[PDB]
Amino acid sequence: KDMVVMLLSLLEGNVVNGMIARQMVDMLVESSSNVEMILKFFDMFLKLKDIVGSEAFQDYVTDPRGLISKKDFQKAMDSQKQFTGPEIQFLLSCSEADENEMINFEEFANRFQEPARDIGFNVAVLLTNLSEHVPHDPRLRNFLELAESILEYFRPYLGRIEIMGASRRIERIYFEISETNRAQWEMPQVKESKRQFIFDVVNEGGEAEKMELFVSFCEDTIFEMQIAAQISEPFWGELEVQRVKFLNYLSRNFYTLRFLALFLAFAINFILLFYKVSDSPPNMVYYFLEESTGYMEPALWCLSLLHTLVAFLCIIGYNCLKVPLVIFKREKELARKLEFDGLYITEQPGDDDVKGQWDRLVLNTPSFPSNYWDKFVKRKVLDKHGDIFGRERIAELLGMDLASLEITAHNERKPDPPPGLLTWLMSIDVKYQIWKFGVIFTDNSFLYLGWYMVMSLLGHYNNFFFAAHLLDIAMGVKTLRTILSSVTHNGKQLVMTVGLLAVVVYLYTVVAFNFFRKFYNKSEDEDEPDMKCDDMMTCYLFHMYVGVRAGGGIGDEIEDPAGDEYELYRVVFDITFFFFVIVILLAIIQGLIIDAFGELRDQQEQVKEDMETKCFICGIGSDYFDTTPHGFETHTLEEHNLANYMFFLMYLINKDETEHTGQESYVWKMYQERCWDFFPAGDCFRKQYEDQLS
Amino acid sequence: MVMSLLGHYNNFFFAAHLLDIAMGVKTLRTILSSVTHNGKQLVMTVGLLAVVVYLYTVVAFNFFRKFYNKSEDEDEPDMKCDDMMTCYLFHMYVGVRAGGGIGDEIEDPAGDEYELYRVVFDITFFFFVIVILLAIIQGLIIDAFG
Amino acid sequence: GQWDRLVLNTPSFPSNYWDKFVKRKVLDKHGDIFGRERIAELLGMDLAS
Amino acid sequence: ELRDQQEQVKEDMETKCFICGIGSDYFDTTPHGFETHTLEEHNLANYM
Ligand SMILES: Nc1ncnc2c1ncn2[C@@H]1O[C@H](COP(=O)(O)OP(=O)(O)OP(=O)(O)O)[C@@H](O)[C@H]1O
Ligand SMILES: Nc1ncnc2c1ncn2[C@@H]1O[C@H](COP(=O)(O)OP(=O)(O)OP(=O)(O)O)[C@@H](O)[C@H]1O
Ligand SMILES: O=c1[nH]cnc2n[nH]cc12
Ligand SMILES: [Ca+2]
Ligand SMILES: [Zn+2]
Ligand SMILES: [Zn+2]
Numbered sequence: 001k002d003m004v005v006m007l008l009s010l011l012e013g014n015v016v017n018g019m020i021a022r023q024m025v026d027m028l029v030e031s032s033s034n035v036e037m038i039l040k041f042f043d044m045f046l047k048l049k050d051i052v053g054s055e056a057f058q059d060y061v062t063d064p065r066g067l068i069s070k071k072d073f074q075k076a077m078d079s080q081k082q083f084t085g086p087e088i089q090f091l092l093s094c095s096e097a098d099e100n101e102m103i104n105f106e107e108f109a110n111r112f113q114e115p116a117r118d119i120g121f122n123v124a125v126l127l128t129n130l131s132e133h134v135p136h137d138p139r140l141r142n143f144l145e146l147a148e149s150i151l152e153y154f155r156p157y158l159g160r161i162e163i164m165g166a167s168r169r170i171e172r173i174y175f176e177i178s179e180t181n182r183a184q185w186e187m188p189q190v191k192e193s194k195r196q197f198i199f200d201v202v203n204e205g206g207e208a209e210k211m212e213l214f215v216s217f218c219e220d221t222i223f224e225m226q227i228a229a230q231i232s233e234p235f236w237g238e239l240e241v242q243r244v245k246f247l248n249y250l251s252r253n254f255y256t257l258r259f260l261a262l263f264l265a266f267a268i269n270f271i272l273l274f275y276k277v278s279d280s281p282p283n284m285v286y287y288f289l290e291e292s293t294g295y296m297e298p299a300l301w302c303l304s305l306l307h308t309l310v311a312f313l314c315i316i317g318y319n320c321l322k323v324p325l326v327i328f329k330r331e332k333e334l335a336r337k338l339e340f341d342g343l344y345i346t347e348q349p350g351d352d353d354v355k356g357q358w359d360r361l362v363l364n365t366p367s368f369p370s371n372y373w374d375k376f377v378k379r380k381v382l383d384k385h386g387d388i389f390g391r392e393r394i395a396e397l398l399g400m401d402l403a404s405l406e407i408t409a410h411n412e413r414k415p416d417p418p419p420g421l422l423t424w425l426m427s428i429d430v431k432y433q434i435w436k437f438g439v440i441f442t443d444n445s446f447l448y449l450g451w452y453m454v455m456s457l458l459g460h461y462n463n464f465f466f467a468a469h470l471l472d473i474a475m476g477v478k479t480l481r482t483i484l485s486s487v488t489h490n491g492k493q494l495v496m497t498v499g500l501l502a503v504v505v506y507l508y509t510v511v512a513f514n515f516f517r518k519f520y521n522k523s524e525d526e527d528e529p530d531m532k533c534d535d536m537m538t539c540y541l542f543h544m545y546v547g548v549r550a551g552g553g554i555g556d557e558i559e560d561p562a563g564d565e566y567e568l569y570r571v572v573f574d575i576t577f578f579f580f581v582i583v584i585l586l587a588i589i590q591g592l593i594i595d596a597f598g599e600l601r602d603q604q605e606q607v608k609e610d611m612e613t614k615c616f617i618c619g620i621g622s623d624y625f626d627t628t629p630h631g632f633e634t635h636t637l638e639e640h641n642l643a644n645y646m647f648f649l650m651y652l653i654n655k656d657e658t659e660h661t662g663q664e665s666y667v668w669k670m671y672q673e674r675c676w677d678f679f680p681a682g683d684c685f686r687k688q689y690e691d692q693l694s
Numbered sequence: 695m696v697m698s699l700l701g702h703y704n705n706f707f708f709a710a711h712l713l714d715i716a717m718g719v720k721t722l723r724t725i726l727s728s729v730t731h732n733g734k735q736l737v738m739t740v741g742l743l744a745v746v747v748y749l750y751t752v753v754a755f756n757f758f759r760k761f762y763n764k765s766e767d768e769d770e771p772d773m774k775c776d777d778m779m780t781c782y783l784f785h786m787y788v789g790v791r792a793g794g795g796i797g798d799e800i801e802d803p804a805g806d807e808y809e810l811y812r813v814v815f816d817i818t819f820f821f822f823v824i825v826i827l828l829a830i831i832q833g834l835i836i837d838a839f840g
Numbered sequence: 841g842q843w844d845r846l847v848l849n850t851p852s853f854p855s856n857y858w859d860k861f862v863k864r865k866v867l868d869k870h871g872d873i874f875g876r877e878r879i880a881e882l883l884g885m886d887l888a889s
Numbered sequence: 890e891l892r893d894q895q896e897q898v899k900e901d902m903e904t905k906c907f908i909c910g911i912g913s914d915y916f917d918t919t920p921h922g923f924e925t926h927t928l929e930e931h932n933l934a935n936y937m
Binding site (some may be wrong): 269273274275276290391467468470473477530541544545549551554586593597598601662 | 734735738739740741742745749752756759765776777778779793794795797798804813816817820825826828829830832833834836837840
Binding site for chain 1 (some may be wrong): 849872875878
């Protein structure tokens with residue numbers, strides 16, 4: 001593996017048909033027999049690992065202990081028609097058969113899988129690199145074909161990305177994707193987060209901040225994968241282990257708890273449909289259920305208690321599952337604003353930014369970057385701004401001890417961490433906790449869950465308060481959430497048009513009060529009339545209440561103007577009221593809703609069209625890649641896959657800096673400097689080597 | 695074929711075969727596709743309408759019960775909101791089909807201690823149910839056309 | 841897919857599809873690794889014929 | 890119509906240079922090319 005790593009280092013910054021690449025190909029040809037021997041050593045054991053798991057092999061497996069004889073192995077393995085005589089003999093020799101010629105094939109298959117994995121992967125990387133940089137050497141396809149099984153086995157783990165390299169050229173990078181990273185990426189919640197992020201950027205984002213947003217999303221997703229890892233499942237100690245198990249159980253099943261709460265609310269309301277009010281006990285009145293079964297009354301009480309419990313558990317699961325991500329994101333943005341902007345060193349927001357004003361409470365706290373990974377942010381800010389703004393002033397602002405920095409660099413102290421609750425008491429950072437609780441209580445999802453819990457509690461004071469939890473169907477169902485977004489899209493326009501309707505109805509009220517008062521008698525009686533327009537407030541209420549809801553306007557309700565000195569004036573009054581209020585303004589409301597529908601639909605279509613017509617990374621359209629068949633699909637799955645950039649970021653984070661290669665160090669330094677010039681913009685490997693490849 | 699067979703049991707079952715005009719005529723098939731395109735959205739908005747009408751039913755049952763006497767007689771009243779099921783049926787049946795909402799059907803709240811509460815009740819019912827949700831249904835159809 | 845299992849071993853599986861040698865091809869392709877007799881039982885073939 | 894007018898104006902301003910008319914795609918070959926072109930090279934405020 002070390003030798004192959006040296007070879008790969010020789011291939012750094014190597015152009016297509018490069019001298020070093022062709023020299024390496026010639027060297028491999030010079031040792032063709034040995035390279036074939038190595039590739040054969042790998043492929044026989046790779047094939048054995050899957051053969052021993054085959055039903056055809058298990059048919060020959062007959063010993064109850066789980067073993068197989070050498071002769072049985074011989075007749076089973078040549079039945080697969082995959083190895084030759086010498087290869088089967090070699091496998092028999094390598095098998096540690098006992099004096100009874102019994103073979104433990106379970107351990108035999110797994111003996112060399114782990115030891116050979118690293119060298120196998122590096123051989124796959126080397127052959128892939130040579131094949132993609134010397135594409136017209138007939139001697140190399142023989143090695144590629146002999147290494148077909150190795151390449152196929154390592155295909156899911158061989159990640160490749162393209163960067164703008166150290167030499168002002170597009171370079172292709174090969175690295176290793178781990179099984180855990182790929183599996184965590186393929187989780188449905190992470191896929192949904194990816195879809196949401198893609199929609200946000202492609203819809204309401206620009207080209208300038210796109211790569212910044214993508215990297216921020218990658219970091220957030222890495223933190224989410226860590227959260228999933230911790231919450232995943234395979235006297236103080238016992239209570240602690242049970243507590244963390246219970247909290248992880250709540251976190252894993254948060255959405256099932258939400259669905260259960262919804263179902264419980266539905267059941268409670270279905271029972272509530274049977275309520276009946278009677279003056280007789282089951283001058284005030286009694287409310288009671290009216291059913292013959294007799295179990296609905298206890299069932300309602302049980303369901304109410306269970307619904308309250310489920311709501312409380314949902315609150316707990318949320319604060320164990322999403323609150324860490326909220327805090328992580330806020331801490332990260334605050335740290336970057338401190339370092340790269342000096343938000344509280346240079347600009348000092350002008351009291352109109354409630355978020356920035358609230359973040360001041362956390363600056364000097366001992367545990368400010370609790371979730372954000374960078375614990376040295378205060379050090380970096382000090383080193384960056386202390387010379388110009390004062391080391392002591394910066395230290396006071398960030399709550400640092402200047403004397404302790406030296407000793408922390410000096411050595412490490414190992415104190416006694418006593419596992420006592422009394423000692424745990426003052427170990428709490430009260431100011432940081434206040435800041436965190438403010439951040440949480442300003443969060444929309446937490447606020448919704450808290451309102452849900454509060455309404456559940458009020459449901460015990462009065463069971464009809466459980467009707468409010470039926471509104472949870474709006475966010476529980478994505479389709480209903482979209483339909484309601486189709487109303488909330490133009491909410492300000494709807495409010496403004498309602499206010500305009502109020503104003504125009506007020507003008508009509510003024511006219512009616514001044515001139516058409518005799519027509520607002522809504523009393524069939526002759527001696528006590530009920531005049532609706534003898535007061536401005538009463539007339540305005542009458543208009544806004546009956547005229548707007550009337551199909552033909554106010555003229556439907558007020559008296560007939562036939563045979564009056566004001567007949568024409570009043571018919572103009574009624575007709576204009578009908579046209580402006582009933583027709584035009586209500587039609588405006590419907591049109592605002594309908595245009596919101598159309599706008600949302602075309603947003604979805606535009607996002608899909610952009611994703612299917614342009615590369616998310618380089619921006620080159622699908623038309624260029626379609627010159628070669630399936631070119632865009634291969635470009636987005638192998639060349640510029642964004643999942644591969646995310647995996648590369650995780651790979652850099654996990655890998656040791658002293659083990660970083662030249663390209664990896666380049667990208668890592670650019671990442672830490674927050675410079676996104678390594679992302680290919682408007683150029684790709686195929687474009688750069690058009691003449692050579694074609 | 696089954697409906698044709700049932701038509702011999704009762705000739706009025708032959709009316710069902712008139713629906714064959716939907717697939718026999720391409721234009722009508724397209725017009726009906728203009729409805730079936732957003733069928734899930736229409737079902738969801740109908741369910742939402744049911745939920746909001748249920749909330750209004752709950753409010754009416756708890757507070758505005760005296761206004762649901764639909765009997766002109768003086769000694770035997772027909773109270774429509776003395777049971778939750780009856781009140782919910784009354785709302786979903788008459789309030790949705792009424793042009794001005796439930797306030798068109800229920801009694802006049804003039805000169806009552808709950809006048810303003812009831813006018814807010816009626817106006818919000820008219821705006822949310824009669825205007826907004828029905829407009830959403832029409833818009834789903836029209837967007838399917840487009 | 842669960843319903844298509846009933847037709848695999850039937851003598852007249854490709855009645856309308858033109859390829860009458862599909863069972864032969866599937867056997868030649870997968871019998872070595874998964875068992876000629878098992879594939880023949882799955883597809884209802886007589887290896888002797 | 891009013892909504893699509895606003896969208897069309899925004900799209901034209903974000904996709905073409907107001908002065909030379911060359912589209913953002915040409916300037917995007919160099920990263921941030923259109924932004925730098927409209928802030929330094931062909932800024933209309935600079936012509937004013
Ligand atoms: N740079 C890019 N990286 C990844 N995908 C890209 C890129 N540029 C464009 N795309 C598009 O992103 C889309 C992502 O695929 P999508 O998430 O819809 O998969 P899918 O159809 O659900 O697949 P599966 O069946 O495997 O679940 C692809 O259709 C691809 O064309
Ligand atoms: N020749 C040009 N000169 C100036 N702007 C141009 C030109 N061609 C296109 N534009 C576009 O004009 C837009 C003008 O920016 P705009 O007035 O929207 O700024 P803004 O987002 O409100 O900025 P700020 O945050 O600084 O107030 C830019 O987005 C730019 O892409
Ligand atoms: O997203 C990240 N970027 C850099 N370093 C990190 N450590 N842990 C997570 C990290
Ligand atoms: Ca090194
Ligand atoms: Zn690309
Ligand atoms: Zn220009």
